[PDB]
Design an enzyme around this catalytic site. Sequence first.
Site, PDB file in Angstrom:
ATOM      1  N   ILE A  23       0.826  -1.207   0.000  1.00  0.00           N
ATOM      2  CA  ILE A  23       0.000   0.000   0.000  1.00  0.00           C
ATOM      3  C   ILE A  23       0.863   1.261   0.000  1.00  0.00           C
ATOM      4  CG2 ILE A  23      -1.935  -1.084   1.174  1.00  0.00           C
ATOM      5  CD1 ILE A  23      -0.896   0.400   3.776  1.00  0.00           C
ATOM      6  N   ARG A  25       5.421   2.702  -0.643  1.00  0.00           N
ATOM      7  CA  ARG A  25       6.831   2.406  -0.866  1.00  0.00           C
ATOM      8  C   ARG A  25       7.722   3.583  -0.468  1.00  0.00           C
ATOM      9  NH1 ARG A  25       6.497  -1.029  -4.487  1.00  0.00           N
ATOM     10  NH2 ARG A  25       5.649   0.395  -6.076  1.00  0.00           N
ATOM     11  N   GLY A  26       8.814   3.283   0.229  1.00  0.00           N
ATOM     12  CA  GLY A  26       9.828   4.275   0.577  1.00  0.00           C
ATOM     13  C   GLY A  26      11.211   3.789   0.180  1.00  0.00           C
ATOM     14  N   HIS A  27      12.196   4.672   0.296  1.00  0.00           N
ATOM     15  CA  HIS A  27      13.589   4.322   0.039  1.00  0.00           C
ATOM     16  C   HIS A  27      14.109   3.228   0.985  1.00  0.00           C
ATOM     17  CE1 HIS A  27      17.641   4.997  -1.468  1.00  0.00           C
ATOM     18  NE2 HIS A  27      18.078   5.141  -0.230  1.00  0.00           N
ATOM     19  N   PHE A  28      13.616   3.220   2.224  1.00  0.00           N
ATOM     20  CA  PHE A  28      14.019   2.224   3.230  1.00  0.00           C
ATOM     21  C   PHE A  28      13.202   0.933   3.186  1.00  0.00           C
ATOM     22  CE2 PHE A  28      15.015   6.170   5.996  1.00  0.00           C
ATOM     23  CZ  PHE A  28      16.209   6.371   5.328  1.00  0.00           C
ATOM     24  N   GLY A  29      12.016   0.968   2.586  1.00  0.00           N
ATOM     25  CA  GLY A  29      11.184  -0.226   2.504  1.00  0.00           C
ATOM     26  C   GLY A  29       9.733   0.041   2.175  1.00  0.00           C
ATOM     27  N   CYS A  30       8.980  -1.040   1.982  1.00  0.00           N
ATOM     28  CA  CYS A  30       7.586  -0.947   1.571  1.00  0.00           C
ATOM     29  C   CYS A  30       6.661  -0.730   2.758  1.00  0.00           C
ATOM     30  CB  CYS A  30       7.161  -2.212   0.813  1.00  0.00           C
ATOM     31  SG  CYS A  30       7.827  -2.344  -0.873  1.00  0.00           S
ATOM     32  N   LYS A  43       5.312  -0.602   7.953  1.00  0.00           N
ATOM     33  CA  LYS A  43       6.451  -0.152   7.176  1.00  0.00           C
ATOM     34  C   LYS A  43       7.665  -1.018   7.454  1.00  0.00           C
ATOM     35  CE  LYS A  43       9.103   3.271   5.128  1.00  0.00           C
ATOM     36  NZ  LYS A  43      10.408   3.228   5.811  1.00  0.00           N
ATOM     37  N   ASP A 125      11.178  17.755   7.196  1.00  0.00           N
ATOM     38  CA  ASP A 125      10.710  17.423   5.847  1.00  0.00           C
ATOM     39  C   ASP A 125       9.198  17.582   5.731  1.00  0.00           C
ATOM     40  OD1 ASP A 125      10.777  16.648   3.187  1.00  0.00           O
ATOM     41  OD2 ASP A 125      11.190  14.537   3.606  1.00  0.00           O
ATOM     42  N   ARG A 129       3.307  16.004   0.445  1.00  0.00           N
ATOM     43  CA  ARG A 129       3.554  14.581   0.216  1.00  0.00           C
ATOM     44  C   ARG A 129       3.740  13.797   1.516  1.00  0.00           C
ATOM     45  NH1 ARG A 129       8.308  17.283  -1.414  1.00  0.00           N
ATOM     46  NH2 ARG A 129       9.853  17.044   0.250  1.00  0.00           N
ATOM     47  N   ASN A 130       4.013  14.502   2.622  1.00  0.00           N
ATOM     48  CA  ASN A 130       4.354  13.887   3.896  1.00  0.00           C
ATOM     49  C   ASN A 130       3.263  14.044   4.971  1.00  0.00           C
ATOM     50  OD1 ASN A 130       6.828  12.862   2.954  1.00  0.00           O
ATOM     51  ND2 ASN A 130       7.954  14.744   3.495  1.00  0.00           N
ATOM     52  N   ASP A 143       5.530  11.000   8.150  1.00  0.00           N
ATOM     53  CA  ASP A 143       6.931  10.983   7.676  1.00  0.00           C
ATOM     54  C   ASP A 143       7.917  11.583   8.696  1.00  0.00           C
ATOM     55  OD1 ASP A 143       9.208  10.856   5.817  1.00  0.00           O
ATOM     56  OD2 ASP A 143       8.889  13.011   5.581  1.00  0.00           O
TER      57      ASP A 143
HETATM   58  C1  LIG Z   1      -2.935   2.543  -2.187  1.00  0.00           C
HETATM   59  C2  LIG Z   1      -2.436   3.772  -1.406  1.00  0.00           C
HETATM   60  N1  LIG Z   1      -3.360   4.295  -0.366  1.00  0.00           N
HETATM   61  C3  LIG Z   1      -4.593   4.886  -0.945  1.00  0.00           C
HETATM   62  C4  LIG Z   1      -4.329   6.270  -1.552  1.00  0.00           C
HETATM   63  C5  LIG Z   1      -3.652   3.240   0.636  1.00  0.00           C
HETATM   64  C6  LIG Z   1      -4.150   3.865   1.940  1.00  0.00           C
HETATM   65  C7  LIG Z   1      -3.524   3.152   3.136  1.00  0.00           C
HETATM   66  O1  LIG Z   1      -2.113   3.338   3.218  1.00  0.00           O
HETATM   67  C8  LIG Z   1      -1.558   3.787   4.378  1.00  0.00           C
HETATM   68  O2  LIG Z   1      -2.190   3.764   5.401  1.00  0.00           O
HETATM   69  N2  LIG Z   1      -0.266   4.265   4.318  1.00  0.00           N
HETATM   70  C9  LIG Z   1       0.513   4.820   5.363  1.00  0.00           C
HETATM   71  C10 LIG Z   1       0.078   5.017   6.672  1.00  0.00           C
HETATM   72  C11 LIG Z   1       0.931   5.602   7.595  1.00  0.00           C
HETATM   73  C12 LIG Z   1       2.194   6.014   7.214  1.00  0.00           C
HETATM   74  C13 LIG Z   1       2.622   5.844   5.914  1.00  0.00           C
HETATM   75  C14 LIG Z   1       4.004   6.277   5.441  1.00  0.00           C
HETATM   76  N3  LIG Z   1       4.117   7.639   4.828  1.00  0.00           N
HETATM   77  N4  LIG Z   1       3.621   7.622   3.500  1.00  0.00           N
HETATM   78  C15 LIG Z   1       3.635   8.638   2.677  1.00  0.00           C
HETATM   79  C16 LIG Z   1       3.025   8.476   1.336  1.00  0.00           C
HETATM   80  C17 LIG Z   1       2.003   7.556   1.110  1.00  0.00           C
HETATM   81  C18 LIG Z   1       1.460   7.411  -0.170  1.00  0.00           C
HETATM   82  C19 LIG Z   1       1.927   8.181  -1.233  1.00  0.00           C
HETATM   83  O3  LIG Z   1       1.414   8.091  -2.506  1.00  0.00           O
HETATM   84  C20 LIG Z   1       0.948   6.900  -3.132  1.00  0.00           C
HETATM   85  C21 LIG Z   1       2.937   9.106  -1.007  1.00  0.00           C
HETATM   86  O4  LIG Z   1       3.361   9.851  -2.073  1.00  0.00           O
HETATM   87  C22 LIG Z   1       4.369  10.861  -2.046  1.00  0.00           C
HETATM   88  C23 LIG Z   1       3.484   9.235   0.268  1.00  0.00           C
HETATM   89  C24 LIG Z   1       4.290   9.951   3.086  1.00  0.00           C
HETATM   90  S1  LIG Z   1       3.864  10.349   4.786  1.00  0.00           S
HETATM   91  C25 LIG Z   1       4.161   8.811   5.558  1.00  0.00           C
HETATM   92  O5  LIG Z   1       4.364   8.740   6.750  1.00  0.00           O
HETATM   93  C26 LIG Z   1       1.772   5.247   4.999  1.00  0.00           C
END
Ligand SMILES: CCN(CC)CCCOC(=O)Nc1cccc(CN2N=C(c3ccc(OC)c(OC)c3)CSC2=O)c1
Length: 265
Positions: A23, A25-30, A43, A125, A129-130, A143
């Site tokens: 759901i 992807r980052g530089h350190f992992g999915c 993560k 940062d 996007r964050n 982030d």
């Molecule tokens: C299929 C994608 N999603 C629907 C739009 C699924 C919804 C569920 O996903 C999560 O809960 N992800 C989740 C939760 C908590 C923390 C993080 C990590 N992180 N992720 C960031 C992020 C996420 C998606 C992006 O774009 C695709 C993107 O782009 C520049 C950046 C930046 S800020 C952060 O901390 C991720």
Amino acid sequence: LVQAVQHVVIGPSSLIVHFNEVIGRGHFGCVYHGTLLIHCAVKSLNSQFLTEGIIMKDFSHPNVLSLLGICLSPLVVLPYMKHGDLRNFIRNETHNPTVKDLIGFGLQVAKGMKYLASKKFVHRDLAARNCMLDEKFTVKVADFGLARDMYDKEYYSVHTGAKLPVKWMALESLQTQKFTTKSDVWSFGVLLWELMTRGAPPYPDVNTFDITVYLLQGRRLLQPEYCPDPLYEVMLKCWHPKAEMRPSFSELVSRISAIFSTFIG
Ligand SMILES: CCN(CC)CCCOC(=O)Nc1cccc(CN2N=C(c3ccc(OC)c(OC)c3)CSC2=O)c1
């Protein structure tokens, strides 16, 4: 050693991770969908990173992304954020946020940053996007801490080895590579501009490291078409050359509240 992981550990019997469901992807992992024994994001990471990010366990605020725990290539377990990052949310042209909505999002970011500044924590940062949105469209500053990564590598450039988000950085951080709460305030102003343009990239005619001289010449991002004059004033204050002359996040919450309130939902 500061393995305060101890208090934060999710036992292996309490987490089901769905490795087929990427759901993010980052530089350190999915990031994977997981089930905490609630839905969650998990993560992957691929000592200093963990110890410097583990403070986030103590944080709780509605506009700040919380930590659920660490499972052990350790896994950081975070709240599920149904609507993804703020930048992609506003670039989705199938939905039309109001100007009030967009200012609303910035107001929520300001509240999250106010809380983090009150805990003496420097994000480093901040950008659209964050920030993430949950199912109720609550904006969470994300982030940071154990969630810290590069989630869009287009906007990071190298220069010490660090990958720096140069177009969000305060003038002094570009010169010194040092960050502070007041450099977060600079970044906040850029995020506001992102909001008012519905996620246009800043300084699109400026090659990445030509930004420093551009700002030194006395130049700034131009006022977006839908950005009200008082909010552009806020942005410009956020980019004052002297850090200490920038507004606090407490002042930003108050002034943006006022501006938000003058719009029709
Ligand atoms: C299929 C994608 N999603 C629907 C739009 C699924 C919804 C569920 O996903 C999560 O809960 N992800 C989740 C939760 C908590 C923390 C993080 C990590 N992180 N992720 C960031 C992020 C996420 C998606 C992006 O774009 C695709 C993107 O782009 C520049 C950046 C930046 S800020 C952060 O901390 C991720």
